[PDB]
């Protein structure tokens, strides 16, 4: 329901409170509009985020996002997510798909908000599917926030291609990313995938000693949730994370590239990992392929479509 004189902040106890990320009694016009809102942090202070609950009306919502970042793209109450969802890096958070209903995250685990170097913002993203009340809506997020340091820091490694150009009528083409891990050991606990229409197949793997450890493997054009890992998968200080996009061309006109609109392309891979406290990091990004030799030997599973 929407919130009214109660306001969006409630205190669970002393150090504890849940956060009502909710769209503003909003009314979509056209089928397809993606609605965007902020909300600063109520605290200054340091605080984790530790759980979400999804408060969505399972009529009208496809989709919803959750990101953390200083700098939203507008001082609005709510915009078309096309202007932009932040300035600065949006971190995403929390994912909840339709059709696919998202894992937990663990206990202990928590991702790192607000203080010196956190994200100062909270950014909601609501797609709207199908559309007759005139119904204002406030579909969204409702976050458990801790001032409690968490003994497990959740973290995002992004996996993205950027130089890829996917020809007209092109049977396949394959967008090779890699990096070479370089911090600490982290836990992948979950993935998400994102690809626009021609994309068929999203792999990551974590290659140790020459060998594909396979972190996720999902079609794009599936809900594009987190889903969780099958078994939990450490990266470690030398091992590389590879990923391959799979494209098709056919069905397009002109060549498509990387881009933000719903004509160009994108090959995302979105880890979600957990580190310990005291060696933690909350975003790593890889937008290099630092062995494009190395993906010779990837496994077969990557190539075949789900
Ligand atoms: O992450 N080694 O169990
Ligand atoms: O997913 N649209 O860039
Ligand atoms: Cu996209
Ligand atoms: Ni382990």
Same mark, same amino acid.
């Given at each position: 329901?929407?919130?009214?004189?109660?306001?969006?902040?409630?205190?669970?106890?002393? #150090?504890?409170?849940?956060?009502?990320?909710?769209?503003?009694?909003?009314?979509?016009?056209?089928?397809?509009?993606?609605?965007?809102?902020?909300?600063?942090?109520?605290?200054?202070?340091?605080?984790?985020?530790?759980?979400?609950?999804?408060?969505? #009306?399972?009529?009208?919502?496809?989709?919803?996002?959750?990101?953390?970042?200083?700098?939203?793209?507008?001082?609005?109450?709510?915009? *078309?997510?096309?202007?932009?969802?932040?300035?600065?890096?949006?971190?995403?958070?929390?994912?909840?798909?339709?059709?696919?209903?998202?894992?937990?995250?663990?206990?202990?685990?928590?991702?790192?908000?607000?203080?010196?170097?956190?994200?100062?913002?909270?950014?909601?993203?609501?797609?709207?599917?199908?559309?007759?009340?005139?119904?204002?809506?406030?579909?969204?997020? #409702?976050?458990?926030?801790?001032?409690?340091?968490?003994?497990?820091?959740?973290?995002?490694?992004?996996?993205?291609?950027?130089?890829?150009?996917?020809?007209?009528?092109?049977?396949?083409?394959?967008?090779?990313?890699?990096?070479?891990?370089?911090?600490?050991?982290?836990?992948?606990?979950?993935?998400?995938?994102?690809?626009?229409?021609?994309?068929?197949?999203? #792999?990551?793997?974590?290659?140790?000693?020459?060998?594909?450890?396979?972190?996720?493997?999902?079609?794009?054009?599936?809900?594009?949730?987190?889903?969780?890992?099958?078994?939990?998968?450490?990266?470690?200080?030398?091992?590389?994370?590879?990923?391959?996009?799979? *494209?098709?061309?056919?069905?397009?006109?002109?060549?498509?590239?990387?881009?933000?609109?719903?004509?160009?392309?994108?090959?995302?891979?979105?880890?979600?990992?957990?580190?310990?406290?005291?060696?933690?990091?909350?975003?790593?990004?890889?937008?290099?392929?630092?062995?494009?030799?190395?993906?010779?030997?990837?496994?077969?599973?990557?190539?075949?479509?789900?």
């Amino acid at each position: 329901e929407c919130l009214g004189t109660i306001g969006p902040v409630t205190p669970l106890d002393a #150090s504890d409170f849940a956060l009502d990320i909710r769209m503003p009694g909003v009314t979509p016009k056209e089928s397809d509009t993606y609605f965007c809102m902020s909300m600063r942090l109520p605290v200054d202070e340091e605080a984790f985020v530790i759980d979400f609950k999804p408060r969505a #009306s399972m009529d009208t919502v496809h989709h919803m996002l959750l990101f953390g970042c200083n700098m939203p793209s507008s001082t609005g109450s709510y915009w *078309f997510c096309d202007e932009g969802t932040c300035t600065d890096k949006a971190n995403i958070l929390y994912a909840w798909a339709r059709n696919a209903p998202p894992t937990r995250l663990p206990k202990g685990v928590g991702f790192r908000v607000g203080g010196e170097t956190g994200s100062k913002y909270f950014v909601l993203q609501v797609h709207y599917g199908d559309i007759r009340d005139n119904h204002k809506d406030c579909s969204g997020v #409702s976050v458990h926030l801790t001032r409690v340091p968490q003994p497990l820091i959740a973290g995002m490694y992004l996996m993205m291609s950027v130089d890829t150009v996917i020809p007209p009528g092109e049977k396949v083409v394959n967008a090779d990313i890699s990096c070479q891990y370089k911090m600490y050991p982290m836990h992948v606990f979950a993935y998400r995938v994102h690809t626009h229409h021609l994309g068929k197949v999203v #792999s990551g793997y974590r290659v140790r000693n020459g060998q594909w450890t396979l972190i996720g493997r999902q079609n794009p054009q599936l809900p594009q949730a987190f889903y969780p890992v099958e078994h939990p998968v450490d990266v470690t200080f030398g091992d590389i994370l590879a990923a391959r996009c799979v *494209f098709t061309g056919e069905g397009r006109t002109e060549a498509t590239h990387i881009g933000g609109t719903s004509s160009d392309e994108m090959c995302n891979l979105y880890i979600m990992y957990y580190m310990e406290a005291k060696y933690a990091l909350s975003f790593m990004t890889c937008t290099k392929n630092v062995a494009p030799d190395m993906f010779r030997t990837i496994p077969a599973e990557a190539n075949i479509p789900i």
